[PDB]
Amino acid sequence: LCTASIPPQCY
What was the structure determination method?
NMR
Query: Rounded to whole angstroms, how far apart are CA atoms 2 and 10?
Result: 4
Query: Rounded to whole angstroms, how far apart are CA atoms 2 and 8?
Result: 6
For residues 9 and 1, is the Cβ–Cβ distance under 8 A?
no
Exposure letters 1-11 (e unless 16+ CB within 10 A, then b): eeeeeeeeeee
For residues 4 and 10, is the Cβ–Cβ distance under 8 A?
no
Amino acid at 11: Y
Query: Rounded to whole angstroms, how far apart are CA atoms 5 and 11?
Result: 12
DSSP of 1-11? -B-S-SS--B-
For residues 9 and 3, is the Cβ–Cβ distance under 8 A?
yes
